[PDB]
Design a binder for this molecule. Sequence first.
Ligand SMILES: O=C(O)CNC(=O)C(=O)O
Ligand SMILES: [Mg+2]
Ligand code: NI
Ligand SMILES: [Zn+2]
Length: 331
Amino acid sequence: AQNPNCNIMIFHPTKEEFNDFDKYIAYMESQGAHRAGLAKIIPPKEWKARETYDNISEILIATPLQQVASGRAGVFTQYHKKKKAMTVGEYRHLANSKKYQTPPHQNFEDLERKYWKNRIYNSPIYGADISGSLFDENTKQWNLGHLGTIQDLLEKECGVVIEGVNTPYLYFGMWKTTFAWHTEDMDLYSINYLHLGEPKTWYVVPPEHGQRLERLARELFPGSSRGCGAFLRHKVALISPTVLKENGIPFNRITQEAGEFMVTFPYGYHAGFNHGFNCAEAINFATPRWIDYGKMASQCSCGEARVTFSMDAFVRILQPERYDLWKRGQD
Ligand SMILES: O=C(O)CNC(=O)C(=O)O
Ligand SMILES: [Mg+2]
Ligand code: NI
Ligand SMILES: [Zn+2]
C-alpha cells in the first residue's frame, strides 16, 4: 500500500504532465496521495494563472463575514456576522490596517502559535464564497473554471443525466480568517489555488480516520451533536492541533503559499487559517473513485447546512433513501 502513514505529499508536475488534469489526479492517487486527505501541487515554472493581479480591486465582496468566536482557545465555534459590501481594494486596506494586520513574527511556526493562542480574541472579516474566477481564459492547464463538471462525471460513470452546474468560488482572506473542520459537500474533492498574497495553513485528517475526528467533535461540542447527526456540515467548529494530539487524532499540517495548488480528497476533513491578506480560488470536482464516497456521505437534515442547487441531484441519485428527509432540511 502506498503512503501507509498518510503523509501529505507534494508534487512537482512537468509542463507535459500538467496537460491532463484527470490523468495527474489518478497518478497522485497511484502514489498514495489521497491517504493523507490533502496534497500540494507546485505548478511547472512555465505556467501562470494569469498575467498580473494588478486589476482586481474592483471585485465586490457583497457579503463580507465577520468570524466571531466562542469557546476556549483550542476548542471553539465561529459564527458569521454579515457586514456591509465592500470592494477587494477596500477589503485589502482593512486587512492591512493596524486592527487586522498580521503581527510581527519569526516564521510560520511562530505565527501558528500566535494563531492558536489568540484567534478567539479577534473577529477577522472573510470575503468567502464569491462566485467567480481569476484564471485567464487563455490558461489551458489547471484552469479551475474549465474543469470537467461533477454532473458530467456522474453521467459518464453512472449513465444518469442530471441538472446542475459546477463553478468556482473566490476567497479573500486576512490574518486569522478561519475555515472550520469539514469535508466537502457530498464528500467531493476540492482543489484550491492561492492566487496571491499571504499563506494559508491547512490541517487534515486522513479519510480512513475521519470517524475518529467525528467522535471527538461529538464529545467536544455535545449540544451541537444532539442537534444534528452531521453538525460538522455546518462548518463552524474548530479544534486545535494541541487538542487533536491530546486526544490521539491522526492529522497532518502544511502551509500553502501563493502560486500553489492544494487538493483535498473525498472524506478528508480539513481546517485552517490565513496568514494575512490573500486571495484563493476553489472548486469541487469528482473522479470515478469519488462515487462510492458520495453514496455514503453524511448529511445535515436539521436545516443549518443549507447548500447549493446542484447538491439536490447528487442526493436524489446517490442517496434516494435520504432524499425526502434531506430535502425537508433544505426547505
Ligand atoms: O480556503 C478556504 O477558506 C476554504 N477552502 C476549502 O475548504 C477548500 O478549498 O476545500
Ligand atoms: Mg477589478
Ligand atoms: Ni474545503
Ligand atoms: Zn445540521
